[PDB]
Amino acid sequence: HSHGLFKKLGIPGPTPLPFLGNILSYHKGFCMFDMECHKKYGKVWGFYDGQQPVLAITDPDMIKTVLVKECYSVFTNRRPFGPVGFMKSAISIAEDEEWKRLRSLLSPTFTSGKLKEMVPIIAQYGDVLVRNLRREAETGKPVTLKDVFGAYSMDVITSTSFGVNIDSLNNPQDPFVENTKKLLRFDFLDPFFLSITVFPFLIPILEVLNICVFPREVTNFLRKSVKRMKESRLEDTQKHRVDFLQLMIDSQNSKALSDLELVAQSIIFIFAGYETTSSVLSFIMYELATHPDVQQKLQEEIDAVLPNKAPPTYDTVLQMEYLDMVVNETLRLFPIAMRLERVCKKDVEINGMFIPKGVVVMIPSYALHRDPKYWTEPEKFLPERFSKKNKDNIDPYIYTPFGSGPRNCIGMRFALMNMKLALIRVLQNFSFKPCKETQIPLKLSLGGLLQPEKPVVLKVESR
Amino acid sequence: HSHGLFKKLGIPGPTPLPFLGNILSYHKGFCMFDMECHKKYGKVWGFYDGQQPVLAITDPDMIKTVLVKECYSVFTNRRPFGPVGFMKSAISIAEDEEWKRLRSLLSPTFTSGKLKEMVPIIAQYGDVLVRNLRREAETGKPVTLKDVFGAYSMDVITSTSFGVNIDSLNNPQDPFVENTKKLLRFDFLDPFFLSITVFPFLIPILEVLNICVFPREVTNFLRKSVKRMKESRLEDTQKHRVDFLQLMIDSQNSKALSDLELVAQSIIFIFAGYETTSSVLSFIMYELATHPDVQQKLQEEIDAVLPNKAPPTYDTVLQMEYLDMVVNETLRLFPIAMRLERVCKKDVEINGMFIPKGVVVMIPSYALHRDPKYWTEPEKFLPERFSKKNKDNIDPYIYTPFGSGPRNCIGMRFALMNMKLALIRVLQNFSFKPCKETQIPLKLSLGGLLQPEKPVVLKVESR
Ligand SMILES: CC(C)c1nc(CN(C)C(=O)N[C@H](C(=O)N[C@@H](Cc2ccccc2)C[C@H](O)[C@H](Cc2ccccc2)NC(=O)OCc2cncs2)C(C)C)cs1
Ligand SMILES: CC(C)c1nc(CN(C)C(=O)N[C@H](C(=O)N[C@@H](Cc2ccccc2)C[C@H](O)[C@H](Cc2ccccc2)NC(=O)OCc2cncs2)C(C)C)cs1
Ligand code: HEM
Ligand code: HEM
């Protein structure tokens, strides 16, 4: 029984139960579990996900070692998370040289030049969003911001990546949004995902049964969508710009990117660009609404840089320090990650401490983001933390909302800009106010993914 | 999750953990678990073996109902205990009409007439045992009684059932004993049996992999042993007597008993007649040695009925009240059963209480045997409890060392006599004394089967 390993290495931790490990402790959300474990254990601890030994680490240097120094040699892959099917070839799930080949190929997608060619493309979509909101602005009833941001983010990602205008904004009952949000119902009171975290030995078996954590009732829709919208649809080059679709087409003809492998990456992009982007935007608006001085101070920058509702540009976006601070701050309090993780591929002693092969190393981002060692009054939302005159007191290995090292978020620059353009255009025309149903203080979901327990509703007013 | 059933019926019990149920409580042996649950819960309680709801019952009337009144209609089978292979056809494992057909056929094996024809057959074996013990009597060093009783019991059962003299007594390194004791290594610190009690949904899968809880490295030896010792070995009838082997041969020719089905029953008989018989005999000798007045009072009866070491007979055995009392008493304190169990086949309300389909009903014999409600000073060994003048204060449904109703021990009369003849012949020539390594007070095995934690060693002296 691999359960005696952490006591056998002198590493502290909560007592494992047979078979379950410590999974019962996720009863109050694992973020809480992490915070407790930090308070009580220190720099370093160990616990079990079923039989799977995880090792939490909090030392900055040790974190840098793992994420950056030894990524290529030792800590190269994340943990396998369940029965995955064809999606084994998605970049974020892919391991070692198959991942590195995919990384190398998709790296060029998000260069400042490729990015600045999206500035005008999104610009046209920000106009549609503005208009959508003005419609509810005129009505004056609570908005579920994920709905409006969702379709926005979907329209943005679909056009930037493939060239296709699916027009999600002008479509409430939209198949592309409706299918994509059903993709991961991750939940521990959901008897399925619990059981593969506990019992991952059933994984090999479910693969052979073509069972995915992804409803095939989704992946088939997305498979058919991308199927010939790559093929007979994009043909005569025609208006062909910077689209990752082509970058995967262009590097198929004259190494070698398969067809199902192509669909697989697209799904990663569609999901990231929809769910992640829209969740964060919803989190910032909640903060800006529960903090009006912050919302105003921002609206002032927005007009100070773009004189009286002027159209945003690449260079214009980067200039705005306070807008970057507001985004960074929300991401401090609401990390979509909530844990960074790497599988130990061979044996190592990192900075005077030994990790055996097969162990999962886990950085508890959520916890470290709220640690009194690094953060003054870490509970409070304080954008001023990220000002030019305070960001040196910030440790680059305690604050990583995008991960770090060679496996960090490939989408960082895209999402930052995409989110900011959305914000600018929105605050440039509207102000946001608390509602009667607005969950204050907002509690997070007890289960898996970082989401509100109650969906975010707020009042919208034009200026 | 079937875990809310017992609170949903208003039936008390220890709080189930997800997946595990209450199995963690078997940490101190389930007998202890039962006693606690009795003390604290009362007449009736519920707990979970994994997802499997067990219901413990202690009411005499309710017990009689289950074992006797509703056996045929409702409580007909025991629980499936793991991957079983060809042994699915063994009588004790067999369900419903397939079991009833087998019962009906093997019932006649143990009639007083069939039994009295074994009296002279065992008589010859008791002579060999006596001699074996006299050899260690002359040496004067601690005896492991299971060794001597084992070979005795093996010789008895093999000759009575098949007609074959395998001569286990005159053979230390005997394949028949050495293979048979490896048949069930039942244990909870044994990671295998634990996991199928918890996770019996893996059973269907292991069957298809020809995995038995019985080492095939045993069943193949026993399969080949019985294989042609039935066939070309027993041919010209020749000396053919009362042997169950023939009773299964005789009712194959001119319903219909298969060949692998034949081997299956034999294994049940060989095991019962070896392990059960020899364990009890070891338990009585421990009691008789830790209680010399009891050993003497018995030796007096033995000679009072059989004048100066006379040869025992059927009728002679039955007469001896005190010998029956000593056997009954040891069986009160050391039930080889330790729980009686039945699967609820359809819905029922037994005496004003409702049981849903699929629930296991369990009588906690070990516990009830040591209950102050029925037994004075139940901890103490007191044969006098079973005297003609006290046995009315004994409830036939609290004391069932052989089970009750149509599924009770088919071997009851055989084992009683076989054990008694062994005892008579032994005490008729020897006295038994505590040793320096004799575990006092003797503790039972924490795990599954009723066995000593330490093997029983005692000193033997001739008279
Ligand atoms: C006990 C343990 C298994 C648990 N972890 C969590 C939450 N945490 C911390 C995770 O790392 N959860 C994992 C995850 O999403 N890993 C991801 C890397 C990551 C980690 C944290 C934050 C951002 C990206 C890596 C996986 O390949 C996922 C799986 C996936 C694929 C398609 C659609 C949805 C999801 N693919 C992603 O690339 O998601 C798209 C994203 C892009 N950018 C941010 S998310 C999986 C186990 C779900 C809940 S339970
Ligand atoms: C949680 C639960 C599953 C557990 N129970 C126990 C102990 N108790 C109480 C049992 O009932 N244990 C069960 C058992 O042996 N059942 C038995 C009926 C019984 C019950 C109690 C006392 C005497 C006979 C019924 C099963 O068919 C066994 C299995 C077997 C087959 C060949 C060789 C060895 C074993 N077959 C028997 O007929 O054993 C031979 C015997 C004949 N007479 C007494 S034992 C199995 C689950 C092992 C440990 S863990
Ligand atoms: C605010 C929005 C986003 C946040 C906070 C975010 C955050 C992260 C984080 C924390 C990781 C894991 C890094 C690590 O383990 O070290 C990650 C991985 C990744 N993200 Fe994002 N992300 C966002 C948006 C996007 C977008 C828009 C895309 C592209 C469509 C994207 C694509 C990816 C990919 C492909 C990976 C896997 C990297 C690899 O394994 O090579 N993300 N993201
Ligand atoms: C002291 C010795 C023995 C004891 C205490 C004993 C006890 C028991 C008990 C308690 C049961 C279960 C009854 C129930 O669930 O109600 C049982 C079943 C059984 N015993 Fe025994 N037994 C002994 C010896 C033997 C012998 C020698 C044989 C035959 C070789 C035998 C054959 C069986 C069989 C076949 C069953 C299953 C009955 C059925 O399902 O039809 N036992 N025994």
Kind and range of the H or E element at B340?
A: strand B340-344
Cβ-proximal residues to A187 (8 Å cutoff; 6+ apart), any chain = A193, A447, A448
Give the atom of ligand 1 at the shortest distance from the alpha carbon of A82.
47
The SS3 assignment for B209 reads coil
CB A302 within 8 A of CB A308: no
DSSP B249-315: HTTT------SHHHHHHHHHHHHIIIIIHHHHHHHHHHHHHH-HHHHHHHHHHHHHHSTTTPPP-HH
Ligand 4: which residue has its CA nearest to atom 29?
A: B411
Measuring CA to CA, how many Å separate A38 from each of A201, A448, B413? 29, 20, 66
Kind and range of the H or E element at B431?
A: strand B430-433
The SS3 assignment for B104 reads helix
CB of B408 sitting under 6 A from ligand 4: yes
Cβ-proximal residues to A94 (8 Å cutoff; 6+ apart), any chain = A88, A102
CB B48 within 8 A of CB B16: yes
Report DSSP state, residue B51: T
- The residue type found at B40 is K
- Going from the Cα of A416 to the center of ligand 3, the distance in angstroms, rounded, reads 11
CB contact under 8 A, A19 and B17: no
CB A158 within 8 A of CB A185: no
What is the pairing mode between strands B360-363 and B52-57?
A: parallel
CB A313 within 8 A of CB A177: no
Buried b / exposed e across B142-157, counting CB within 10 Å, b at 16+?
bbebbbbbbbbbbbbb
CB of A338 sitting under 6 A from ligand 1: yes
Kind and range of the H or E element at B176?
A: helix B175-180
What is the pairing mode between strands B430-433 and A340-344?
A: unpaired
Which ligand has its closest atom nearest to the C-alpha of A88? Answer: 1
**Chain A contacts of B1, Cβ < 8 Å?**
191
Kind and range of the H or E element at B41?
A: helix B30-41
Shortest distance, CA A19 to any CA of chain B (angstroms):
8
B53 burial level (CB within 10 Å; 0-12, 13-18, 19+): buried
Report DSSP state, residue B405: G
Q: Which of A90, A152, A119 is nearest to A414 (CA)?
A: A119
Total domain count, chain A: 1
Tokens 């996900």 -> residue: A49
d(CA A182, CA B439): 64
Method for structure elucidation: X-ray
d(CA A366, CA A32): 9
d(CA B89, CA B263): 9
Q: Report the length, in residues, of chain A.
A: 463
- Going from the Cα of B95 to the center of ligand 2, the distance in angstroms, rounded, reads 15
Cα angle: B174, vertex B227, B193; to 5 degrees: 65
Kind and range of the H or E element at B427?
A: helix B412-427
Measuring CA to CA, how many Å separate A33 from each of A30, A40, A47, B18? 5, 11, 11, 18
CB B164 within 8 A of CB B229: yes
CB contact under 8 A, B20 and A20: yes
Measuring CA to CA, how many Å separate B216 from each of A119, B213, B221, B222, B227? 72, 9, 8, 9, 15
CB B329 within 8 A of CB B298: no
Q: Which of A322, A336, A321, A319 is nearest to A281 (CA)?
A: A336
Which residues 19-38 of chain A have a CB within 8 Å of chain B? Answer: 19-20, 24
Q: Is B457 left (phi over 0), alpha (psi -120 to 50) or beta?
A: beta
Q: Which of B237, B236, B294, B247 is nearest to B269 (CA)?
A: B247
B189 at interface of A, judged by CB pairs closer than 8 A: no
B274 burial level (CB within 10 Å; 0-12, 13-18, 19+): buried
d(CA B235, CA B214): 30
Q: Which of B1, B19, B191 sits opposite A20 (nearest CB)?
A: B19
Residue to probe by mutation, ligand 2, list B268, B269, B369, most atoms within 8 Å of CB: B268
Cβ-proximal residues to A1 (8 Å cutoff; 6+ apart), any chain = A18, A51, B191
CB A339 within 8 A of CB A59: no
A324 burial level (CB within 10 Å; 0-12, 13-18, 19+): middle
CB contact under 8 A, A18 and B20: yes
B318 at interface of A, judged by CB pairs closer than 8 A: no
CATH of the domain at A209: 1.10.630.10
CB of A409 sitting under 6 A from ligand 1: yes
Give the atom of ligand 3 at the shortest distance from the alpha carbon of A414.
27
The SS3 assignment for B232 reads coil
Token pair, residue B107, equals: 């019932």
- Going from the Cα of A415 to the center of ligand 3, the distance in angstroms, rounded, reads 9
What is the pairing mode between strands B353-355 and B348-350?
A: antiparallel
Domain that holds residue B244: 1-463
- Going from the Cα of A407 to the center of ligand 3, the distance in angstroms, rounded, reads 9
Measuring CA to CA, how many Å separate A213 from each of A184, A259, A262, A264, B108? 7, 21, 19, 14, 58
The SS3 assignment for B44 reads strand
Q: Which of B395, B406, B225, B385 is nearest to B321 (CA)?
A: B385
Cβ-proximal residues to B31 (8 Å cutoff; 6+ apart), any chain = B338, B366, B367, B444
CB contact under 8 A, A18 and B19: no
Q: What are phi and psi of B117, to 5 degrees?
A: -80, -5
Which ligand has its closest atom nearest to the C-alpha of B104? Answer: 4
A18 at interface of B, judged by CB pairs closer than 8 A: yes
- Going from the Cα of A332 to the center of ligand 3, the distance in angstroms, rounded, reads 16
Q: Which of A1, A19, A191 sits opposite B20 (nearest CB)?
A: A19
d(CA B44, CA A420): 65
d(CA A327, CA A415): 11
Report DSSP state, residue B361: E
Which ligand has its closest atom nearest to the C-alpha of B149? Answer: 4
B17 at interface of A, judged by CB pairs closer than 8 A: yes
Cβ-proximal residues to B18 (8 Å cutoff; 6+ apart), any chain = A20, A24, B1, B3
d(CA B70, CA B348): 10
Q: Which residue of A has its CA nearest to B195?
A: A19
Instruction: Tally Cβ neighbours within 10 Å of residue A236.
Output: 6
